[PDB]
């Protein structure tokens, strides 16, 4: 196990075949999730990118965060997927947390801090355990498929997630740098493999 | 009476059929009111929605707080109505406050602690006592008769209600947060009916 | 003398009956004067309306502060016209003070506690001290004659007159509510009588 | 109600005049609370002072939070107390938060965003709701006996307070500066008295 | 079963009543365990203390982890002991695993993720399924027997039990936060009794 | 000498008359100047008007800070000529420092504090000391010739002059307000004549 | 050595002669480096320049940093180029560090404490230490054919070189002004040569 | 004037008659001031020493900042004490700010960034506009008196002084070394005369 503190993935071209892989010994399917990330590109006004791509082998769309040109995060879960529409958009590091929940299929977004408003998605559906979670890319078969026109460049990190929806209070304790524990993915103690050109480099972001 | 202190509904759909109904203990009909609520939706670049509908047998919109497309508020008591315009819209939690005083028709209308200028409406009316006081949607019966496409979808809270105009002093301790106690409708002390898709959640706003 | 502090003279319908006027003690003419208030009023993209009116019976615009549409501020004295422009109008409780001295002409105004530039009127003149003092409406006889489209509506108040040009460190007292003492016209003992639909209420500016 | 946000209460000489006393207007007798407060002395070598007394007719320490020489924070509810002892100490500004809970007595102190154990106190008691609140000063009858011995020398702010136990994220959010509504008593809104030689300066810490 | 995800027990006053019983499934007798838990409290300077007791019938301390004042944990199985001594120690939540083997005797110390030196403790040695596992309090019958100077006081929780020696990567994992699932005693799915005192609160840890 | 600190004269009519004449004790003629004043006017938006007309007998534009509508400060030393362009300018009083140095020809222009880019100008010039230096209108022979349509109206104070270019520091502390002597025109202790419609009035600038 | 400590060099005319050499003490090819320096120029609306110029005899843009029109920086390294588009401008002094790695690529670009995205130039490539630093020309030969409409016309200065990537942290307390310690190319320790018209004044940038 | 910038006093020699005096262009007696110094000295173990000692003919110490062995800083104004003690100290360069006010006599002391708490000294005093600044030596008359044991032997520089009482946040300006610029005494743009063994070097310090 890696501590990343203070590192961030750099993917500096773009191309099919850089990413990273992050691996959970994750046994249980998931009944709810909370995923938070810092990320930087100057895509956002060219194209769309994959922010963070979660696979299983019935399904290559599990979890996706991804940006669309001109209309904002795409979120998704169970290839289902729903709509946080940006219209403003300015080059800046930004820190996002998004949480599902099956029971009431809510998904929570939060963008820098600022909730957006509470939507529905995939009510009593269950996230697959087995999957393949991947950096850079956009799964179209579990762990591959990559299209280049989908990969993330710029930079990545603090990419945490626990399996269960955070609250409110919690989520402003993590943008603020507060102490937390994350229970599926620990950007402090992350085991991952790097394929292609990425590079481990000192965050930009505070 | 349950607290929901730090709560907010949710109406994550839309739908029809998706509403809370709140019981007030409100015996003697109101020569003046004041209600006080949070909302958060997208939808105000969309299409008008149902804030808070107050209906009494006689007349289904004794008092109701509306959005109206490219307008703004909707602020009608009696069936009656005066607008507060508002051009451009951001997409944020908004505090509310409203004022209604017979003897005058004054309305104050406040959002996120600015006021609004008082305007006059429904002067030397009187507002029902039985009362079906519905959040969620619009209603055009007691109880009933909900439109979908003026349901709200998003969060609403903190809806306090008072039998007297609030000072803007006061007002001013509703938005900040300090002390106060609200004598027809207290979300700390609440008495409601929940039917279909609507849930309890940690409040989104501060 | 009534103690008018935190209250203020609301006139929520337009009409040409509605409006107070106010008893100055004054016996000299007028050399010199200043005159601060606030108002609030969402006209200022309608229409036109009068602030502040001040008629003498040779003289029915002996000084005439009024909201031009699509202009700014018409500032008169004698009958005679000067403009301060405002391109932009936003809705917000506006403080002026306008300050006319007979020695020099000079009239300053000053608008949220920034000054205009000084700019010359009726140099030489002097203004009546049997004066009628209104608020609400233009007066186009000494005590009469109103016109409904030129009346206010909204909220207006801490109306403050002196017989000398207040110094700028003195106005920016008045603009912060610092301790002033009018002599010609005192908020703090006002004399003043009502007709029609006007109320006193706890002013909204802060 | 006065926005002291950024400004600390300074009481720069030892005295038993200089106090400040906070208006709450608290309909319902106290279950629960938090008061968190952020402070800076010297004396803590030199004597015990009282950080924040509350007190009702019937009890003077009815609650008191006091540093005790040698030993360190001195908590009261009722006038029974428990001790947080705190074996060295630096010269710096302290944040705390303290909370306590009638239903299980259990008291949480918070200092610099670090919990101390939970300790029992008071189990099953009804803090008054008609209190004299003041800071500087520790009181011995409901407005009154200070003692000069136990007065604050040097700087207290932030004074924030609410009717329920604050959760652990809450408190790390107040610690970290994040966004929080205190619903008893809040520094964006405090309505004070100020007596004595006591001065609003800008806030020495962060 | 319960889900005690992020709440601890708290034992807010010393006594010989207030204690938690746990209820493993365990059938089969124990070769070897890992228990793992996060506990706090200030008692290590005043007296020791029984962090963890498990009972069966024939030997009371079947395994306990008990601190010891001035001289640090203490380790027993099967009646045996062995300590850890820790010369200084500092108030602040302290996670710990132990884990033994019986094909080595090999007892491994884990406090807040720093390995101890593996120590040799009860060789071939077999505990008991039919066992009784008790927080709170230390046990010298099957379910009682208490004695008020070992109770802890204080929080605990966090509290994992597997049947098999964790690898050290593991246990990083379980001291940073990473995903898990304990097979003898686990957090996330608990059956328990709580008798006298005993409160569900927040854990104060991260 | 007058001290006219805190003072400004007020150009409040467009005329071709209205001007005050300012006397340099000065008998060097001047490899280097700098010149600071702070003016307030409104016709920026409607035409050119000069700021500071310095002329000598051979030269009527021998130093000449102007506005030039759509364009900005026109400087010119020795009728030569170069442009500060201004693509928006507030109505806010202005305070600028022009700095001219022979040896290099450097200009130096600052407004309300930042400097514009240096430029080149008059390399190797000297400006000749028997000049008539005149405010509120721009000359063409030695003392006449003015302009209605070259007027200033508005405000015109704080005019100090240096025969040594301020380095940035200094400057900046004329801005603040620090300390400073003036060693060619001063206005602390300033020769002027008035001629014309011409007020001494209190400068309305801080 | 020259301590060029709060000075900068002047090229306030157009021309293809003005220019400063800056010669490294530099023996060993650079594996990495980073240059940032302090400039201010009106040009940047109007037409493309050259910021900072290093050439060697197989190479004149061995090190580019260029403004071009309409696009924003150029950072070319061996003759390669990538952009740093900038959408808009403002005429105010701009501070810049940019990174090179040879090991990874990675190109950094700050903007007065901003990061621009890391992007990927020359990887493997290595600049040779034979080198030509020129301020106030782009060279196309070893030292000379300046090309006019490339010249840099305003102020350059703090312009400091280190053989290595300077961390985020770093170039933070470079934009603050902390201590620092550029080993190849030393402000406060400059060895320069002059040619042409160049001056060096005080720095208008704090 | 000399901008003293990068360079400090050295008093290398324990003497009474190495000093160098200060002039204040001070027009006008203080109602308040800030005095930020750098020095450096070994003697803080050995005997007290005078850092800043202001002097007028009525007042030897009118403002004196001094260490007094084992104690800490004397700060006194009009001759009254007040003392910053402090126990440990360590042989580095050191940074102080002191600041006082007459209207409320608060005086605030910060070392290298840290505020000492705020004391109350001579409220309602006027400090005297003819004074002797010297450094090196404290005087006991107007211009002399000087004792060798209260020489400073070391390094004293950035003697920066103010008028007002900076904001704690200007102070860490003052700290960082952001833009400042003092309106009493300015170590950019120092009038001062050396007598003895005075040398000017170098700062040590960053
Ligand atoms: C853009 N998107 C997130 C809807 C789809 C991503 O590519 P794909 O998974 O549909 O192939
Ligand atoms: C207020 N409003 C007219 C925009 C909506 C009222 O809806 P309804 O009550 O007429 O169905
Ligand atoms: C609108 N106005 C103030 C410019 C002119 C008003 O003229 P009148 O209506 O008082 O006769
Ligand atoms: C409890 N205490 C003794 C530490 C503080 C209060 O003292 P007192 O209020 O009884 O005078
Ligand atoms: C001493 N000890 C606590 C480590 C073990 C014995 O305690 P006990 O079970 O005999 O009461
Ligand atoms: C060109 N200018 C408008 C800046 C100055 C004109 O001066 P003048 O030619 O009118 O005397
Ligand atoms: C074109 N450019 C801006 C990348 C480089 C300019 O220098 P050059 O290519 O003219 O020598
Ligand atoms: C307090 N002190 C010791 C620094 C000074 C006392 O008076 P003096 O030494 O300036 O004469
Ligand atoms: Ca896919
Ligand atoms: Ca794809
Ligand atoms: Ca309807
Ligand atoms: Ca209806
Ligand atoms: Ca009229
Ligand atoms: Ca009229
Ligand atoms: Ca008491
Ligand atoms: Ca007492
Ligand atoms: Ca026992
Ligand atoms: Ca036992
Ligand atoms: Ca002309
Ligand atoms: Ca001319
Ligand atoms: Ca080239
Ligand atoms: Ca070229
Ligand atoms: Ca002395
Ligand atoms: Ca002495």
Chains 1, 2, 3, 4, 5, 6, 7, 8 share one sequence.
């Not at 959970?24 to 791509?53: D, M, N, Q, W």
């Not at 696979?55 to 209309?71: C, G, H, M, V, Y």
């Not at 219209?87 to 929570?108: D, F, L, M, Q, R």
């Not at 591959?144 to 609250?167: A, H, K, R, T, Y």
Request: aromatic share 14%; glycine share 8%; hydrophobic share 35%.
């Amino acid at each position: 196990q890696t501590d990343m503190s203070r590192k961030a993935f750099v993917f500096p071209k773009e191309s099919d075949t850089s990413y990273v892989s992050l691996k959970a010994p994750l046994t249980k399917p998931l009944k709810a999730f909370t995923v938070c990330l810092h990320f930087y590109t100057e895509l956002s006004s060219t194209r769309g990118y994959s922010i963070f791509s979660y696979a299983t082998k019935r399904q290559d769309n599990e979890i996706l965060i991804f940006w669309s040109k001109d209309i904002g995060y795409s979120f998704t879960v169970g290839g289902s997927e729903i709509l946080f529409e940006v219209p403003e958009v300015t080059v800046a590091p930004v820190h996002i947390c998004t949480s599902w929940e099956s029971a009431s299929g809510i998904v929570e977004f939060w963008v820098d801090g600022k909730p957006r408003v509470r939507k529905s998605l995939k009510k009593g559906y269950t996230v697959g355990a087995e999957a393949s979670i991947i950096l850079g890319q956009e799964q179209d078969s579990f762990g591959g498929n990559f299209e280049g026109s989908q990969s993330l460049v710029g930079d990545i990190g603090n990419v945490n997630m626990w399996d269960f929806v955070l609250s409110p209070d919690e989520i402003n304790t993590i943008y603020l740098g507060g102490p937390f524990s994350p229970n599926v993915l620990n950007w402090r103690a992350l085991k991952y493999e790097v394929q292609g050109e990425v590079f481990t480099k000192p965050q930009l972001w505070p």
